[PDB]
């Protein structure tokens, strides 16, 4: 399935925020949120069906799925690992997009933001 029409570029931003010292219950050191958003705000539900965040196996249930904005997963942990972000489209002939993001957690400052720009190339109907 491959389109026969106009091409659409929708820029996006993906990555995580994390805040430190946040332990007795479970030894965890950080809260973090991993996310995908549009570069400029828009209702990304117009074309995104759902976004999967595949976590490290140390998480119970490493497969996380979000279907409505904001496309984010918040968690606590002790470690950095690579997260696979897979974006699925409403249109069944627009193939999914797979992103990879190294979760960053960590000396005086408490918060970290690791954020990348990308672009989804959809193809639109040729109205």
């Amino acid at each position: 399935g491959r389109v026969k029409g106009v091409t659409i570029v929708k820029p996006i931003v993906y990555g995580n925020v994390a805040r430190y010292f946040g332990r007795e219950e479970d030894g965890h050191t950080h809260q973090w949120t991993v996310y995908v958003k549009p570069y400029r705000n828009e209702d990304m539900s117009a074309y995104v069906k759902k976004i999967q965040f595949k976590l490290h196996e140390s998480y119970g249930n490493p497969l996380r799925v979000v279907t409505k904005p904001p496309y984010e997963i918040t968690e606590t942990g002790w470690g950095e690992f690579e997260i696979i972000i897979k974006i699925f489209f409403i249109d069944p002939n627009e193939r999914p997009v797979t992103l990879y993001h190294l979760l960053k957690l960590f000396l005086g400052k408490k918060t970290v933001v690791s954020e990348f720009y990308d672009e989804m190339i959809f193809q639109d109907p040729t109205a």
Binding site: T29, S58, E80, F81, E82, L105
Partner: peptide, 6 residues
């Protein structure tokens, strides 16, 4: 896979 603390 790899997951590493500070």
């Amino acid at each position: 896979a790899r997951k590493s603390a500070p």
